[PDB]
mmCIF file with all atom_site columns, C-alpha atoms in Angstrom:
data_model
loop_
_atom_site.group_PDB
_atom_site.id
_atom_site.type_symbol
_atom_site.label_atom_id
_atom_site.label_alt_id
_atom_site.label_comp_id
_atom_site.label_asym_id
_atom_site.label_entity_id
_atom_site.label_seq_id
_atom_site.pdbx_PDB_ins_code
_atom_site.Cartn_x
_atom_site.Cartn_y
_atom_site.Cartn_z
_atom_site.occupancy
_atom_site.B_iso_or_equiv
_atom_site.pdbx_formal_charge
_atom_site.auth_seq_id
_atom_site.auth_comp_id
_atom_site.auth_asym_id
_atom_site.auth_atom_id
_atom_site.pdbx_PDB_model_num
ATOM 1   C CA . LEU A 1 1   ? 79.691 45.426 32.664 1.00 0.00 ? 153 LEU A CA 1
ATOM 2   C CA . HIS A 1 2   ? 81.040 45.162 35.663 1.00 0.00 ? 154 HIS A CA 1
ATOM 3   C CA . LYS A 1 3   ? 78.992 43.926 39.435 1.00 0.00 ? 155 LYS A CA 1
ATOM 4   C CA . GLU A 1 4   ? 79.217 45.938 42.461 1.00 0.00 ? 156 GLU A CA 1
ATOM 5   C CA . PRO A 1 5   ? 77.525 44.995 45.706 1.00 0.00 ? 157 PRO A CA 1
ATOM 6   C CA . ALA A 1 6   ? 73.836 45.018 46.850 1.00 0.00 ? 158 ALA A CA 1
ATOM 7   C CA . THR A 1 7   ? 72.309 43.776 50.122 1.00 0.00 ? 159 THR A CA 1
ATOM 8   C CA . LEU A 1 8   ? 68.847 41.826 50.302 1.00 0.00 ? 160 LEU A CA 1
ATOM 9   C CA . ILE A 1 9   ? 66.112 43.625 51.478 1.00 0.00 ? 161 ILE A CA 1
ATOM 10  C CA . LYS A 1 10  ? 63.090 41.692 50.532 1.00 0.00 ? 162 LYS A CA 1
ATOM 11  C CA . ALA A 1 11  ? 62.254 39.839 47.797 1.00 0.00 ? 163 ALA A CA 1
ATOM 12  C CA . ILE A 1 12  ? 59.332 40.957 46.030 1.00 0.00 ? 164 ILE A CA 1
ATOM 13  C CA . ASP A 1 13  ? 58.104 38.356 43.242 1.00 0.00 ? 165 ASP A CA 1
ATOM 14  C CA . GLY A 1 14  ? 59.857 36.046 40.756 1.00 0.00 ? 166 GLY A CA 1
ATOM 15  C CA . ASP A 1 15  ? 60.752 39.469 38.680 1.00 0.00 ? 167 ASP A CA 1
ATOM 16  C CA . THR A 1 16  ? 61.143 41.886 41.270 1.00 0.00 ? 168 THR A CA 1
ATOM 17  C CA . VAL A 1 17  ? 63.786 41.969 44.813 1.00 0.00 ? 169 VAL A CA 1
ATOM 18  C CA . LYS A 1 18  ? 64.467 45.007 46.964 1.00 0.00 ? 170 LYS A CA 1
ATOM 19  C CA . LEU A 1 19  ? 67.747 45.710 47.942 1.00 0.00 ? 171 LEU A CA 1
ATOM 20  C CA . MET A 1 20  ? 70.199 48.206 49.486 1.00 0.00 ? 172 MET A CA 1
ATOM 21  C CA . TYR A 1 21  ? 72.208 49.392 46.773 1.00 0.00 ? 173 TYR A CA 1
ATOM 22  C CA . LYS A 1 22  ? 75.044 52.308 47.837 1.00 0.00 ? 174 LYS A CA 1
ATOM 23  C CA . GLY A 1 23  ? 73.141 52.731 50.395 1.00 0.00 ? 175 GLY A CA 1
ATOM 24  C CA . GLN A 1 24  ? 69.764 53.495 49.418 1.00 0.00 ? 176 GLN A CA 1
ATOM 25  C CA . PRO A 1 25  ? 66.628 51.066 49.123 1.00 0.00 ? 177 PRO A CA 1
ATOM 26  C CA . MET A 1 26  ? 65.846 50.178 45.883 1.00 0.00 ? 178 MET A CA 1
ATOM 27  C CA . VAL A 1 27  ? 63.203 48.143 43.884 1.00 0.00 ? 179 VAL A CA 1
ATOM 28  C CA . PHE A 1 28  ? 65.051 45.895 41.169 1.00 0.00 ? 180 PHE A CA 1
ATOM 29  C CA . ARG A 1 29  ? 63.244 44.270 37.978 1.00 0.00 ? 181 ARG A CA 1
ATOM 30  C CA . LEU A 1 30  ? 65.327 41.339 36.753 1.00 0.00 ? 182 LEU A CA 1
ATOM 31  C CA . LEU A 1 31  ? 66.839 42.365 33.036 1.00 0.00 ? 183 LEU A CA 1
ATOM 32  C CA . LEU A 1 32  ? 65.088 40.038 29.981 1.00 0.00 ? 184 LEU A CA 1
ATOM 33  C CA . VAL A 1 33  ? 63.215 37.988 31.947 1.00 0.00 ? 185 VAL A CA 1
ATOM 34  C CA . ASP A 1 34  ? 58.979 37.612 32.270 1.00 0.00 ? 186 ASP A CA 1
ATOM 35  C CA . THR A 1 35  ? 58.109 35.503 35.064 1.00 0.00 ? 187 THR A CA 1
ATOM 36  C CA . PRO A 1 36  ? 54.259 34.376 35.744 1.00 0.00 ? 188 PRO A CA 1
ATOM 37  C CA . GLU A 1 37  ? 53.674 36.926 38.386 1.00 0.00 ? 189 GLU A CA 1
ATOM 38  C CA . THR A 1 38  ? 52.033 36.798 41.712 1.00 0.00 ? 190 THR A CA 1
ATOM 39  C CA . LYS A 1 39  ? 51.396 40.550 41.340 1.00 0.00 ? 191 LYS A CA 1
ATOM 40  C CA . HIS A 1 40  ? 48.343 42.676 39.712 1.00 0.00 ? 192 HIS A CA 1
ATOM 41  C CA . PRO A 1 41  ? 45.305 42.197 39.163 1.00 0.00 ? 193 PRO A CA 1
ATOM 42  C CA . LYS A 1 42  ? 44.258 41.472 35.980 1.00 0.00 ? 194 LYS A CA 1
ATOM 43  C CA . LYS A 1 43  ? 45.042 37.118 35.514 1.00 0.00 ? 195 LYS A CA 1
ATOM 44  C CA . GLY A 1 44  ? 46.367 37.142 39.535 1.00 0.00 ? 196 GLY A CA 1
ATOM 45  C CA . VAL A 1 45  ? 48.369 34.682 41.160 1.00 0.00 ? 197 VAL A CA 1
ATOM 46  C CA . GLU A 1 46  ? 49.272 33.363 37.525 1.00 0.00 ? 198 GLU A CA 1
ATOM 47  C CA . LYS A 1 47  ? 49.851 29.835 37.683 1.00 0.00 ? 199 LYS A CA 1
ATOM 48  C CA . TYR A 1 48  ? 53.813 28.789 38.542 1.00 0.00 ? 200 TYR A CA 1
ATOM 49  C CA . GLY A 1 49  ? 53.860 32.302 39.775 1.00 0.00 ? 201 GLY A CA 1
ATOM 50  C CA . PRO A 1 50  ? 53.683 31.090 43.543 1.00 0.00 ? 202 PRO A CA 1
ATOM 51  C CA . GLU A 1 51  ? 56.536 28.890 42.424 1.00 0.00 ? 203 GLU A CA 1
ATOM 52  C CA . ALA A 1 52  ? 58.712 31.684 39.938 1.00 0.00 ? 204 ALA A CA 1
ATOM 53  C CA . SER A 1 53  ? 58.476 33.995 43.324 1.00 0.00 ? 205 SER A CA 1
ATOM 54  C CA . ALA A 1 54  ? 59.587 31.241 45.752 1.00 0.00 ? 206 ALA A CA 1
ATOM 55  C CA . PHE A 1 55  ? 62.503 30.293 43.167 1.00 0.00 ? 207 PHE A CA 1
ATOM 56  C CA . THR A 1 56  ? 63.824 33.988 43.939 1.00 0.00 ? 208 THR A CA 1
ATOM 57  C CA . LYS A 1 57  ? 62.924 34.454 47.198 1.00 0.00 ? 209 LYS A CA 1
ATOM 58  C CA . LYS A 1 58  ? 65.176 31.251 48.188 1.00 0.00 ? 210 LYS A CA 1
ATOM 59  C CA . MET A 1 59  ? 68.006 31.918 45.858 1.00 0.00 ? 211 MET A CA 1
ATOM 60  C CA . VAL A 1 60  ? 68.688 35.735 47.473 1.00 0.00 ? 212 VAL A CA 1
ATOM 61  C CA . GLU A 1 61  ? 68.008 34.553 50.599 1.00 0.00 ? 213 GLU A CA 1
ATOM 62  C CA . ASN A 1 62  ? 70.328 31.706 51.141 1.00 0.00 ? 214 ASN A CA 1
ATOM 63  C CA . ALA A 1 63  ? 72.961 33.823 49.484 1.00 0.00 ? 215 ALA A CA 1
ATOM 64  C CA . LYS A 1 64  ? 76.775 34.765 50.942 1.00 0.00 ? 216 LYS A CA 1
ATOM 65  C CA . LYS A 1 65  ? 77.125 37.430 48.443 1.00 0.00 ? 217 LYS A CA 1
ATOM 66  C CA . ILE A 1 66  ? 74.326 39.471 46.102 1.00 0.00 ? 218 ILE A CA 1
ATOM 67  C CA . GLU A 1 67  ? 75.605 41.342 43.195 1.00 0.00 ? 219 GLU A CA 1
ATOM 68  C CA . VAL A 1 68  ? 74.243 43.545 40.704 1.00 0.00 ? 220 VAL A CA 1
ATOM 69  C CA . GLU A 1 69  ? 75.143 44.052 36.815 1.00 0.00 ? 221 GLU A CA 1
ATOM 70  C CA . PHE A 1 70  ? 74.082 46.374 35.012 1.00 0.00 ? 222 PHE A CA 1
ATOM 71  C CA . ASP A 1 71  ? 73.404 46.625 31.440 1.00 0.00 ? 223 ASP A CA 1
ATOM 72  C CA . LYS A 1 72  ? 74.811 49.214 28.392 1.00 0.00 ? 224 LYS A CA 1
ATOM 73  C CA . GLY A 1 73  ? 71.941 51.132 28.222 1.00 0.00 ? 225 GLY A CA 1
ATOM 74  C CA . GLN A 1 74  ? 69.191 52.880 30.484 1.00 0.00 ? 226 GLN A CA 1
ATOM 75  C CA . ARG A 1 75  ? 69.995 51.603 34.205 1.00 0.00 ? 227 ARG A CA 1
ATOM 76  C CA . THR A 1 76  ? 65.609 52.676 35.469 1.00 0.00 ? 228 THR A CA 1
ATOM 77  C CA . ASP A 1 77  ? 62.657 51.984 34.079 1.00 0.00 ? 229 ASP A CA 1
ATOM 78  C CA . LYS A 1 78  ? 59.015 54.418 34.426 1.00 0.00 ? 230 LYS A CA 1
ATOM 79  C CA . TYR A 1 79  ? 58.931 53.362 37.331 1.00 0.00 ? 231 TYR A CA 1
ATOM 80  C CA . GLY A 1 80  ? 61.920 53.921 38.813 1.00 0.00 ? 232 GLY A CA 1
ATOM 81  C CA . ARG A 1 81  ? 63.177 50.656 39.236 1.00 0.00 ? 233 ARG A CA 1
ATOM 82  C CA . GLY A 1 82  ? 66.463 49.103 38.589 1.00 0.00 ? 234 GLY A CA 1
ATOM 83  C CA . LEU A 1 83  ? 67.154 47.063 35.195 1.00 0.00 ? 235 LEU A CA 1
ATOM 84  C CA . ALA A 1 84  ? 69.844 44.622 36.177 1.00 0.00 ? 236 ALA A CA 1
ATOM 85  C CA . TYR A 1 85  ? 71.487 41.198 35.738 1.00 0.00 ? 237 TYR A CA 1
ATOM 86  C CA . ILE A 1 86  ? 71.184 39.705 39.624 1.00 0.00 ? 238 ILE A CA 1
ATOM 87  C CA . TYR A 1 87  ? 73.984 37.211 40.674 1.00 0.00 ? 239 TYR A CA 1
ATOM 88  C CA . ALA A 1 88  ? 73.883 35.192 43.987 1.00 0.00 ? 240 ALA A CA 1
ATOM 89  C CA . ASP A 1 89  ? 76.981 33.913 45.541 1.00 0.00 ? 241 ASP A CA 1
ATOM 90  C CA . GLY A 1 90  ? 77.823 33.869 41.557 1.00 0.00 ? 242 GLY A CA 1
ATOM 91  C CA . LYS A 1 91  ? 75.181 32.381 39.977 1.00 0.00 ? 243 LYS A CA 1
ATOM 92  C CA . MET A 1 92  ? 72.595 34.812 37.692 1.00 0.00 ? 244 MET A CA 1
ATOM 93  C CA . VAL A 1 93  ? 68.964 34.285 39.466 1.00 0.00 ? 245 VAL A CA 1
ATOM 94  C CA . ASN A 1 94  ? 67.971 36.040 35.739 1.00 0.00 ? 246 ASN A CA 1
ATOM 95  C CA . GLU A 1 95  ? 69.433 32.595 33.780 1.00 0.00 ? 247 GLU A CA 1
ATOM 96  C CA . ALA A 1 96  ? 68.813 30.072 36.900 1.00 0.00 ? 248 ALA A CA 1
ATOM 97  C CA . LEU A 1 97  ? 64.903 31.325 36.324 1.00 0.00 ? 249 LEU A CA 1
ATOM 98  C CA . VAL A 1 98  ? 64.680 30.575 32.706 1.00 0.00 ? 250 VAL A CA 1
ATOM 99  C CA . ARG A 1 99  ? 66.661 27.019 33.081 1.00 0.00 ? 251 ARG A CA 1
ATOM 100 C CA . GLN A 1 100 ? 64.365 26.197 35.344 1.00 0.00 ? 252 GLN A CA 1
ATOM 101 C CA . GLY A 1 101 ? 61.543 26.524 32.843 1.00 0.00 ? 253 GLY A CA 1
ATOM 102 C CA . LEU A 1 102 ? 60.298 29.125 35.489 1.00 0.00 ? 254 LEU A CA 1
ATOM 103 C CA . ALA A 1 103 ? 60.347 32.465 33.177 1.00 0.00 ? 255 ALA A CA 1
ATOM 104 C CA . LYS A 1 104 ? 60.386 33.142 29.491 1.00 0.00 ? 256 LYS A CA 1
ATOM 105 C CA . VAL A 1 105 ? 63.378 35.513 27.885 1.00 0.00 ? 257 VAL A CA 1
ATOM 106 C CA . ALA A 1 106 ? 61.080 38.854 27.624 1.00 0.00 ? 258 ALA A CA 1
ATOM 107 C CA . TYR A 1 107 ? 61.245 41.439 25.068 1.00 0.00 ? 259 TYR A CA 1
ATOM 108 C CA . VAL A 1 108 ? 64.405 43.178 24.058 1.00 0.00 ? 260 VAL A CA 1
ATOM 109 C CA . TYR A 1 109 ? 64.988 46.384 24.104 1.00 0.00 ? 261 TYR A CA 1
ATOM 110 C CA . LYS A 1 110 ? 68.512 47.308 22.861 1.00 0.00 ? 262 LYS A CA 1
ATOM 111 C CA . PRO A 1 111 ? 70.984 47.796 23.884 1.00 0.00 ? 263 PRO A CA 1
ATOM 112 C CA . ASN A 1 112 ? 69.817 46.489 27.007 1.00 0.00 ? 264 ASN A CA 1
ATOM 113 C CA . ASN A 1 113 ? 70.167 42.991 25.775 1.00 0.00 ? 265 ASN A CA 1
ATOM 114 C CA . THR A 1 114 ? 73.993 41.843 26.575 1.00 0.00 ? 266 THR A CA 1
ATOM 115 C CA . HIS A 1 115 ? 73.691 38.326 28.126 1.00 0.00 ? 267 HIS A CA 1
ATOM 116 C CA . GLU A 1 116 ? 70.881 38.324 25.599 1.00 0.00 ? 268 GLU A CA 1
ATOM 117 C CA . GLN A 1 117 ? 71.720 34.948 23.269 1.00 0.00 ? 269 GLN A CA 1
ATOM 118 C CA . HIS A 1 118 ? 72.771 33.169 27.044 1.00 0.00 ? 270 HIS A CA 1
ATOM 119 C CA . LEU A 1 119 ? 69.783 33.442 28.135 1.00 0.00 ? 271 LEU A CA 1
ATOM 120 C CA . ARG A 1 120 ? 67.606 32.651 25.444 1.00 0.00 ? 272 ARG A CA 1
ATOM 121 C CA . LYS A 1 121 ? 70.172 29.090 25.072 1.00 0.00 ? 273 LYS A CA 1
ATOM 122 C CA . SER A 1 122 ? 68.830 28.586 28.946 1.00 0.00 ? 274 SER A CA 1
ATOM 123 C CA . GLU A 1 123 ? 64.994 28.910 27.599 1.00 0.00 ? 275 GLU A CA 1
ATOM 124 C CA . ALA A 1 124 ? 65.912 26.676 25.039 1.00 0.00 ? 276 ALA A CA 1
ATOM 125 C CA . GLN A 1 125 ? 66.639 23.462 26.660 1.00 0.00 ? 277 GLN A CA 1
ATOM 126 C CA . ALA A 1 126 ? 64.255 24.109 29.331 1.00 0.00 ? 278 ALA A CA 1
ATOM 127 C CA . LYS A 1 127 ? 61.606 23.939 26.626 1.00 0.00 ? 279 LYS A CA 1
ATOM 128 C CA . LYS A 1 128 ? 63.131 20.268 25.205 1.00 0.00 ? 280 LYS A CA 1
ATOM 129 C CA . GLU A 1 129 ? 63.498 19.168 28.783 1.00 0.00 ? 281 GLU A CA 1
ATOM 130 C CA . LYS A 1 130 ? 59.535 20.329 28.999 1.00 0.00 ? 282 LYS A CA 1
ATOM 131 C CA . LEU A 1 131 ? 60.096 21.798 32.500 1.00 0.00 ? 283 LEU A CA 1
ATOM 132 C CA . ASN A 1 132 ? 57.154 23.603 34.574 1.00 0.00 ? 284 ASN A CA 1
ATOM 133 C CA . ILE A 1 133 ? 56.115 26.513 31.975 1.00 0.00 ? 285 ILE A CA 1
ATOM 134 C CA . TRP A 1 134 ? 57.228 24.177 28.986 1.00 0.00 ? 286 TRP A CA 1
ATOM 135 C CA . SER A 1 135 ? 55.203 20.890 30.496 1.00 0.00 ? 287 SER A CA 1
#
């Protein structure tokens, strides 16, 4: 896998950010994580939804460099969103959310599962520290 440059357009939610990638605006879904959401009616603004959402936003908005990293499998989901690991100055946003107790590791679909073990290891530590979702 390799990293490629992207430019922030808009953070949309804890798990979704809109970026300029190869000169086209695109919506990106963070691979392998489930954050509580502020969107979609049903549950509405699920608890820790505003917080997961503010974390992703500050993280990408304050970065000097954003990079995207596609995994080995499909690069788009059925809604046309890019499926990627997103990095802000070197730091993986997907892991940071999980490390902070602001996301769980989602259900996994090979072969888009390269950082799966790393993420589960961060999730295990957040649960052991009983942070946010895990308190």
